[PDB]
Amino acid sequence: EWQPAVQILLYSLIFLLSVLGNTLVITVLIRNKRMRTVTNIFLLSLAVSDLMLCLFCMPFNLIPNLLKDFIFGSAVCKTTTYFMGTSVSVSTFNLVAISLERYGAICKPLQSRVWQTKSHALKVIAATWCLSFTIMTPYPIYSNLVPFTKNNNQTANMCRFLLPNDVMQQSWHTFLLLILFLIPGIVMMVAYGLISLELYQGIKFEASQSAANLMAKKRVIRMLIVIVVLFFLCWMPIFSANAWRAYDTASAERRLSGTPISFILLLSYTSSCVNPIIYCFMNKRFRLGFMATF
């Protein structure tokens, strides 16, 4: 197969860029305590989530998919798959939180101050983390390193999630698709769409009534739409693949195993590089700290 070389390259590149990006974001947000604003506190939580997603998911997916065997043990299967599902859960709920912050900030600006101080930020972060650790508890319990043997007569293992009833496994993936994609996606569409309506109504009202401020707003609207579109492009493939694997399991596995799911997951982790770019390296008030930090 020619695909391993491009898989290895694009994984290594996204891993390097994600480690550099998220650790730079972390170091800039912890070295500049003046920068630890409420929003930047959520961006730190997101950057940590995305670093954890990179460091756990990318090695222990690329390596097993290149080797077509889970060389690690059942404990590593359980631990990795827990941290994967967790960092997906947290990353999504942090994107939701930033959508709802921006909705308060722009669409209800005067009321917003009453309900987004640092205390609300930390309480919501702790809530999303602890909830995510709770609802991901099925992974370490019911993930198992189910054995097989390849035609080389090698003994081999695959880390797979097999909730006991197949019908409960379908309930589970429908629940995860809903709570961890469709509702997050609806909420981000509602939030960033209302923000975009507010901003464009401002633009059209000024065109009826500064040009640099109109450019700054169209740049914000663009960046928000890029957030929504790249969230759907990152996550609709993985979650559709998992829903297919839940309902028509063998038909999904027969087509997506190996290279297709490897790139679908590469998109899912590309989210972890995209997010710190858009939310940090594109922001002025973060660039002005990166050049100030070490």
Binding site: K68, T80, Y139, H173, L176, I238, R254, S257
Partner: peptide
């Protein structure tokens, strides 16, 4: 063989 993928 190796048919499958971890959920995430």
């Amino acid at each position: 063989d190796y048919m499958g993928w971890m959920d995430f």
